[PDB]
């Protein structure tokens, strides 16, 4: 452990064991500071249409969404799964954040 | 008189200070103490955790009590929440006496 020792290794791979396929994907992210570190409520501007009114809060926090497929599957890995298989469901996932560096 | 728990041994005070760092002392010796320091400050998190003990409410009153309820009428700003500029505001003082025990 330390500033000099690296926390994690880049893993991007897809292995097809037999019944199960394990898809791994790694990316590099950058997180700004939102709202200058303070909550704010937000609401529909003046008025527009009865349907478009909204009320809610905007937090400084930010989040990861991998919810799309093509994150995990390369177009070729998609082609294998799609052509050779009737059905697929997920089983278990694992998430990892590493090599964080803060810049001022 | 203000309120709360009179204690003989209160939670002790926690005092904190930046250790002063001198700045560029002159080569030749002088006995007078340093009048000039690096200008610096420090920051970091603080975590306070208290364990409260409660007295469970056991009563037989038939009719319903009074409770503390945030009113359901629509308003520009919700109570106890940030405004559009981010300024957190407490709308009204909240006393602790609502449940009713017979005297």
Q: What is the DSSP string of chain B?
A: --SS---SSPPPP----PPP-B----SS---SPP--B-------------------------S---------S--SS-TTSB-TTS-B---S---S--S----
How many angstroms separate the CA atoms of B90 and B97, rounded? Answer: 19
Whether the Cβ atoms of residue A54 and residue A44 lie closer than 8 Å to each other = yes
Whether the CB of B83 is below 8 Å from some CB of chain A: the reply is: yes
Whether the Cβ atoms of residue B79 and residue B70 lie closer than 8 Å to each other = yes
Whether the Cβ atoms of residue A4 and residue A101 lie closer than 8 Å to each other = no
Ranges of beta strands (E only) in chain A are 13-16, 21-24, 40-43, 55-58
Resolution (A): 3.3
Q: Do B86 and A35 touch (CB under 8 A)?
A: yes
DSSP A81: H
| Distance between A65 CA and the closest CA of chain B, angstroms | 26
Which of B82, B83, B87 should we substitute to test contact with A (largest number of A Cβ atoms within 10 Å)? B82
Name residues whose C-beta falls within 8 Å of residue A95's C-beta, 6 or more positions apart in sequence.
Answer: A64
Tokens 């038939």, residue located: B62
DSSP A50: G
B 36-55: CB under 8 A from A: none
How many angstroms separate the CA atoms of B41 and B35, rounded? Answer: 18
Mark out chain A residues that contact chain B at CB-CB < 8 A: 35, 38-43, 57
In this structure, chain B runs to a length of: 103
Name residues whose C-beta falls within 8 Å of residue B99's C-beta, 6 or more positions apart in sequence.
Answer: B57, B59, B65
Whether the CB of B85 is below 8 Å from some CB of chain A: the reply is: yes
Q: How far is CA B19 from CA B22, B33, B40, B41, B101, in A?
A: 10, 16, 10, 10, 54
Would you call A60 exposed, middle or buried from its count of C-beta atoms within 10 A (0-12, 13-18, 19+)? Answer: middle
Tokens 């050779």, residue located: A84
């Amino acid at each position: 452990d330390g500033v000099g020792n690296s926390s994690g290794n880049w893993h991007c791979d897809s292995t097809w064991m037999g019944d199960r396929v394990i898809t791994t994907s790694t990316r590099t992210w950058a997180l700004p500071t939102y709202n200058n570190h303070l909550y704010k409520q937000i609401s529909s501007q003046s008025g527009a249409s009865n349907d478009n009114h909204y009320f809610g809060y905007s937090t400084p926090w930010g989040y990861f969404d991998f919810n799309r497929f093509h994150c995990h599957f390369s177009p070729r890995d998609w082609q294998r799964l799609i052509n050779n298989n009737w059905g697929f469901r997920p089983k278990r996932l694992s998430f990892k954040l590493f090599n964080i560096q803060v810049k001022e | 008189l203000m309120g709360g728990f009179g204690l003989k041994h209160p939670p002790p005070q926690i005092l904190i200070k930046n250790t002063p760092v001198p700045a560029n002392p002159s080569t030749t010796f002088s006995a007078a103490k340093f009048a000039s320091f690096i200008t610096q400050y420090s920051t970091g998190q603080v975590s306070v955790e208290i364990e409260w003990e409660l007295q469970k409410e056991n009563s037989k009153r038939w009719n319903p009590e009074i409770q503390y309820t945030s009113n359901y009428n629509k308003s520009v700003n919700v109570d106890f929440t940030v405004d559009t500029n981010g300024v957190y505001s407490e709308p009204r003082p909240i006393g602790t006496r609502y449940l009713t025990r017979n005297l």
